[PDB]
Symmetry: C2
Subunit: 293 residues, 2 copies
């Protein structure tokens, strides 16, 4: 009879964790929190709490992490939960594809992220960074959809899940926007050797699309720059990222962005440039990135 | 006849109406100042430019910002007003268009009352509908082509009739619903710190379209605002700071304040992008300094 409250991050790893713990009748409550709120001590944690994918708290019932049951060679916290409770000894065979999807450190194929299907599609359309929620108010909120998906994934297949009204509404918008985003990219993307530059600053609309589309469409580039309007078109934002499909870029992006008052880490960064300087800085970025290879 | 090169804003629309009404133009091209400045726009002697940086080869250049083809009045509140006065005012143009002209003269100076920017009507509504910074743009027709239907219609229909055109009415309905949700989230997510309102939108799933003066109209006791928002793909945090158009008393030089954090702007508006791990420190530092400035 005794059940626990899941405390986790609002992401695909957290959804899958909740699906697994709910399926074995182990949780009856869930609470999505920000990692730094956990680190700062704003989330009260009791011995009736299960924590996944968050920093360790001593008085919790169980803590699953992957960066107290920890496997740092597991690609996700869900995988730790999976293997800890038996895997397919405990869970339906159909969920191996769920586990495959949650485990993707970004080990996707280019094909997988173009016109995505199954669990990958569910993952991308729920991810805040895909931007579905920026671009539309749906029938119900993404928070309330995540909540409802937990129990429905316990007794429905992925193809049925994708047919649910509140999901299929998001699927249709995701499909429409992806098509328009890809034609936008074909109109606005310019290749410079190893770098694809996507100049959006002359487009009326930007479209939602998952964050791997641009890399999948230029498999010969190992780095991208998005050139975009900043807030209320007051300045120009350059966002630079390395390709998950060609990981060979020698640019340290964080250090490069630093020269222009921005930041980031080795594989991703941004900077913000005044309008009268943006052409000069674009040429300089391109020159430097081409020199790096 | 000539080609008009202008911005896709209300000023540009009114300029096209005036020049079309005296049979001076038969094509139009919408561009942003940065493309003119960067030399990306082919300008020829068949072109009339309004409300854009001067480019040398044009037939005429109408400007109101602080040689013989350059018709500049740095004290005019819009380039449409320069056009209006250059071609003779109410002799040349219907005297009934003075209302349209009154509305277009409010834009760059943002000389609005609080009640004009909330639940807007008439020409003010059209202005905010067409302002890219309102954020409205998946409609039947692009904002480009709507601007074209609007140029013709403004030459012969009334503002009330125009707001009932199907392609306009569909934008109006969206604007009204988004403004309702915007005002709700601005009032629930804003926190006043003496002269400043800080609008923390980082936990909203959706940021709704609204004209850029609503926030100041909901916090009339504040002379300055900060929007705290997610940057690109939630990779960092954006702070966008702006002075109020209703209480113009803020003593902060915003552009110089943002410069310390790798951003910039001018005295009255600016932004910066901050690492997630630095956002709490920079938020408090911005508030402290703005509060010390008054
Ligand atoms: Mn993790
Ligand atoms: Mn102007």
């Amino acid at each position: 009879s005794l059940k626990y409250r899941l405390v986790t991050r609002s992401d695909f790893d957290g959804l899958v964790c909740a699906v697994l713990l709910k399926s074995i009748e182990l949780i009856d409550d869930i609470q999505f929190v920000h990692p730094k709120d956990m680190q700062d001590g704003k989330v009260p944690i009791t011995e009736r709490d299960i924590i996944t994918n968050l920093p360790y708290v001593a008085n919790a019932h169980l803590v699953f992490d992957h960066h107290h049951i920890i496997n740092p060679n597991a690609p996700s916290a869900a995988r730790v939960v999976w293997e800890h409770y038996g895997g397919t000894k405990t869970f339906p065979f159909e969920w191996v594809e769920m586990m495959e999807a949650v485990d993707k450190s970004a080990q996707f194929t280019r094909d997988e992220v173009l016109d995505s299907t199954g669990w990958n599609l569910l993952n991308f359309l729920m991810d805040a960074r895909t931007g579905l929620g920026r671009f539309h108010n749906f029938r119900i909120s993404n928070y309330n959809l995540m909540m409802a998906l937990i129990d429905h994934c316990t007794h429905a297949s992925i193809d049925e899940i994708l047919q649910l009204p509140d999901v299929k509404e998001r699927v249709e918008l995701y499909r429409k926007h992806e098509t328009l985003f890809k034609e936008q990219i074909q109109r606005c993307g310019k290749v410079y050797q190893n770098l694809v530059l996507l100049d959006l600053t002359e487009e009326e609309t930007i479209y939602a699309g998952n964050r791997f589309i641009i890399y999948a469409l230029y498999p010969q580039c190992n780095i991208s720059i998005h050139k975009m309007w900043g807030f209320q078109k007051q300045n120009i934002v350059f966002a630079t990222g390395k390709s998950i499909f060609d990981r060979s870029s020698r640019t340290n992006i964080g250090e490069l962005m630093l020269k222009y008052g921005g930041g980031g880490h080795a594989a991703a960064g941004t900077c913000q440039i005044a309008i009268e300087d943006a052409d000069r800085v674009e040429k300089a970025l391109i020159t430097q990135i081409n020199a790096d290879g």
